[PDB]
Assembly symmetry: C3
Homo-oligomer: 275 residues x 3
């Protein structure tokens, strides 16, 4: 845990999503299965604020993002978001779109791996949240749809036009984002959108197993792996090797690197501490 | 379209390529099936000048790039291009190579989607033109050859070294550009070069159908999807979400977004206007 | 290239095997018994050799190979890891800078680099292969980016920059974070393999590819690599400027002119690399 806290206290209760933490693994289950977990303004606000809170306290070592019911997440609620935005002032339109983009950025920047447990529909914001995760663990019913243009918006929504070509290549990104057609599991797997394909109904269990695998590993090493992937997407080669050099040298002063060698020489399992 | 015209008038007749516009869709057909549609200096000049004139008046909602005869385009005419360049002065050599790269840039930047209808060979410049398009609609005879090195020039010609790795990955791009070997339809599909694979002989019809599909949709949403994809290839994550935020907020003030919600509430199809 | 000064070429390379024939350099990693595990001195030789070969433009292609049961298992657990555990801050930084500089030097060589893969390619072995322009691999090839297995991050010596640009961010995150083995079929599917050979034929296929490249127009090949590498880090408008200058320049070269001469008279072009 991080000692760098001040006047601000942790939120006692998260009302717009379900948050459970066990042994360093957070599980965030989207609310509203009867609506395919369609997101509201308040759910975005809780995503933003929860991630900021977990990040500043270095609270967990892995996070699973899940949805109950018939699918993962259908995106923003058509009445509670879209209908409401039709009567918002200019500043509040900008604030809403900035908030969703900073949710995706917060997923990309939080000091622990994020795993999306996917099944049925992941559409609109649901598909971008999945895309921002470090891992997508998906069952065969999983259907992505980047369908912003179908509501008259651009496919550059909350980072999708930045992330998608970096995951699947520019030719596939353009097709997916401009036409908004459904991408079923086999195509998704072929083009690079799936980290682990599971058996039908097993996505949540496999996501939990992957989370625990990561949480059992060297946390600082994992978190810095994510940090360097993310930063170096936006850096030139010469700068990337400077960040690598600094980071690897720092980690070589850590307990975990020393423990690897001690365990290796003593022919036993390493016991990681994440420092 | 766009009222922002001044003293400059539209070109009445395009002489070095065939241009046809029907109901917001431009079809540009390369001339010279006899010569495998090899590109002349004037053909490049007409591409440059037509895209500029289509762009500055937002004239169309989609553009198909096509080639008659046995194949899409064999590249630069060997007698008419290479032979001529061998007696050019230093400023003209630079002018020529600037113009070709400009053409590719203009394809990436024009405010409407561009579709390449591919069959037979797309080689050299013809391969790069196809690569720059937003969609590549290809029948099974389609071949790509990025074969600049075969003529003693570098494979990073007119933007190929920039675009190809962002479409197929750095490993594949290196191999394609350094060796210049033919890529046939199955490999092209595998590595991400093909947007839609058609039956033999159906590429032009399928491209037309796709263009009409795009032209029937919300044109401003499509255009911004392309602009954001293009710009965000060259931006960091934090900047990308600021561009997404301004753009989406802007589109939420548009008629097409409002019409999506109106259509939804009356359970009817949206009638898009592109504003 | 004639641009040499007080500094003389290194007479003998003790920490790897270096053989040059008709413009092709073959670099064979030492220590086949230890799966060619790297020492500090092996890294130093890679750095210093690549710098010599580059400043002289001595070679038109370079093959990176390893003998024994596998390509390269990475840094030596005793001679590197063991040693690093008692190093001071400055030397820890120095070491990790050196490894990244070797990878950068591979990306910046003015000739193509080809990795001849088979068996295990792990840790630095995986990243060295990743940095090569071509990966020529037989079906036994197994990649493992296993830095996190030793408590270090997957952003070792450029891996976090290179891998997503080769296989996509989703695959790169998986590979670098879990460090699981990637066998040949998967490697092929995700874009890590340039040419898949039959068992035991990687070194031969690599030799053949190197010669194919050394037989071609060398300036065109080198600039192809230079532009690919630079343009990964440049925006589109700047990339077409670099292409413009470069193509204009190569159009003043002998090879381009030779091509028109040749292709005209239906005789094969005879390249000169200028
Ligand atoms: Zn990519
Ligand atoms: Zn980039």
């Amino acid at each position: 845990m991080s000692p760098f806290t001040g006047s601000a206290a942790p939120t006692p209760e998260w009302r717009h999503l379900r948050v459970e933490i066990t042994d360093g693994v957070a599980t965030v289950t989207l609310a509203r299965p009867d609506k395919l977990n369609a997101l509201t303004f308040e759910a975005y606000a809780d995503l933003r604020d929860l991630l900021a809170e977990l990040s500043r306290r270095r609270a967990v070592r892995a996070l699973v993002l899940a949805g109950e019911g018939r699918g993962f997440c259908s995106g923003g609620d058509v009445d509670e978001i879209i209908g409401a935005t039709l009567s918002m002032d200019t500043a509040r339109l900008l604030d809403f779109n900035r908030m969703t983009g900073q949710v995706v950025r917060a997923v990309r920047e939080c000091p622990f791996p994020v795993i999306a447990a996917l099944h049925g529909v992941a559409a609109g914001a649901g598909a971008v949240l999945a895309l921002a995760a470090d891992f997508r663990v998906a069952d065969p019913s999983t259907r992505f749809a980047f369908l912003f243009t179908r509501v008259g918006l651009s496919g550059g929504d909350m980072g999708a036009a930045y992330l998608l070509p970096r995951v699947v290549g520019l030719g596939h990104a353009t097709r997916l984002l401009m036409l908004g057609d459904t991408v079923r599991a086999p195509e998704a797997e072929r083009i690079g959108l799936i980290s682990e394909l599971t058996e039908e109904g097993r996505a949540d269990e496999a996501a939990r197993t992957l989370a625990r695998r990561l949480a059992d590993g060297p946390a600082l090493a994992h978190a810095q792996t994510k940090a360097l992937l993310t930063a170096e997407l936006d850096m030139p080669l010469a700068a990337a090797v400077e960040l690598d050099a600094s980071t690897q040298a720092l980690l070589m002063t850590g307990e975990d690197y020393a423990e690897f060698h001690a365990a290796f020489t003593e022919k036993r399992p390493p016991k990681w501490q994440g420092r």
